[PDB]
Design a protein around this ligand. Structure first.
Ligand code: HEM
Length: 404
């Protein structure tokens, strides 16, 4: 059944064979499918024999504690299964070194860059939405959710419009390969692309993200072209699949809940709070760490080299962290989640992501206030490191919409 044999140190009462790439209840919705790990008969910390065999922490308190404890729970191997070539920076690095590359990456996506970009972000959203508005329909995932983050990256990185189809193909192969290329081939292709641009902006710098990363200082010396390509790499792929799929869950829910749409139409000042609460409800990342040594964690013996999945998705859904966690309530006094992670790798794009989400909601709801799922359509989710939405066919009446 693809169950790896149970390591001898793992007690049988801790075994719960969850499959993170194919969970049992997927058709109920992917968050609901993962929430099974939080039923009361399910221990706080379990081992699944799926996918090579690995721990899962199922409660927000454990998830946070392990993300904090990078000395036991290392990022050198963050993906399950173990045999899954990933050299992006700073994602596979622990502190101390991680902190250098992080401060550099922060100069390109940090809050003040985000404030600088806000209306470029709005102008992109408006032109995307305006072109769909008179059609009375779209595949949201395909027609807005994908083109939007990749266009934001071209803006940040100072890259030409004409490169978008090829860059999007390459990033698409990394996360949903059609078979043309291996992951390594897509990566090297991506590197082929970025190397000359980095070399040149080392020499004639702009005020764009590649210029900033190329001309950076690590541990007292300049960044190597290799380190630069591997950072620039993460800056591209880190903001695509997450944003594309998050925007999709959020639009799917809004299309299914006219009352929540109405609330934001009538009170657009609530849109930043609604953004936070959507990020809790439709959280969607689950990566992991590797044990640096033997370690007893909450009464459970963990072995050096064990992988442990620490699902960022699960902290906000945990009923010990938020009451009625499946209920969407834009007025939650305390929205608690780890949707952007927790600890030293906390999402560097978190400020860019919130602006992307806020602007999307504000702009869509004012131009196309009333929209629904396409009659007959059943929305299908998918599950993995980044869970998401397969497609989102939306429809509206063009007469009910505003040219702005
Ligand atoms: C809904 C949108 C997003 C979500 C849910 C999300 C989620 C996450 C999570 C959970 C991590 C930490 C992973 C770990 O600890 O192993 C992370 C890291 C990171 N994210 Fe995001 N992210 C989003 C958007 C973005 C965007 C728009 C960018 C900008 C390009 C970005 C850039 C990064 C980078 C560079 C890291 C590495 C931080 C480090 O290792 O120090 N993210 N993100």
């Amino acid at each position: 059944a693809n169950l790896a044999p149970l390591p001898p140190h793992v007690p049988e009462h801790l075994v719960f064979d969850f499959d993170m790439y194919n969970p049992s209840n997927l058709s109920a919705g992917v968050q609901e499918a993962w929430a099974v790990l939080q039923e009361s008969n399910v221990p706080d910390l379990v081992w699944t024999r799926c996918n090579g065999g690995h721990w899962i922490a199922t409660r927000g308190q454990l998830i946070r504690e392990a993300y904090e404890d990078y000395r036991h729970f290392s990022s050198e191997c963050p993906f399950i299964p173990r045999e899954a070539a990933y050299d992006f920076i700073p994602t596979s690095m622990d502190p101390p070194e991680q902190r250098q590359f992080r401060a550099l990456a922060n100069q390109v996506v940090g809050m003040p860059v985000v404030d600088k970009l806000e209306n470029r972000i709005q102008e992109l959203a408006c032109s995307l939405i305006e072109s769909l508005r008179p059609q009375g329909q779209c595949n949201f995932t395909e027609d807005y959710a994908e083109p939007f983050p990749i266009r934001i990256f071209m803006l940040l990185a100072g890259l030409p419009e004409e490169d978008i189809p090829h860059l999007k193909y390459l990033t698409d192969q990394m996360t949903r390969p059609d078979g043309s290329m291996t992951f390594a081939e897509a990566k090297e292709a991506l590197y082929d692309y970025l190397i000359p641009i980095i070399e040149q902006r080392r020499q004639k710098p702009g005020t764009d993200a590649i210029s900033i990363v190329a001309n950076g200082q690590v541990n007292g010396r300049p960044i190597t072209s290799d380190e630069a390509k591997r950072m620039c790499g993460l800056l591209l792929v880190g903001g695509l699949d997450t944003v594309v799929n998050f925007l999709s869950f959020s639009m799917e829910f809004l299309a299914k809940s006219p009352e929540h749409r109405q609330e934001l139409i009538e009170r657009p000042e609530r849109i930043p709070a609604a953004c936070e609460e959507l990020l809790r409800r439709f959280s969607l990342v689950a990566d992991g760490r590797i044990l640096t040594s033997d370690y007893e964690f909450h009464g459970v013996q963990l072995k050096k080299g064990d992988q442990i999945l620490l699902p960022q998705m699960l902290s906000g859904l945990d009923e010990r962290e938020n009451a009625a966690p499946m209920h969407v309530d834009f007025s939650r006094q305390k929205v608690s989640h780890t949707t952007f992670g927790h600890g030293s790798h906390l999402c560097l794009g978190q400020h860019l992501a919130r602006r992307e989400i806020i602007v999307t909601l504000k702009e869509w709801l004012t131009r196309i206030p009333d929209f629904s799922i396409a009659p007959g359509a059943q929305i299908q989710h998918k599950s993995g490191i980044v869970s998401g939405v397969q497609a989102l066919p939306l429809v509206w009446d063009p007469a009910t919409t505003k040219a702005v």
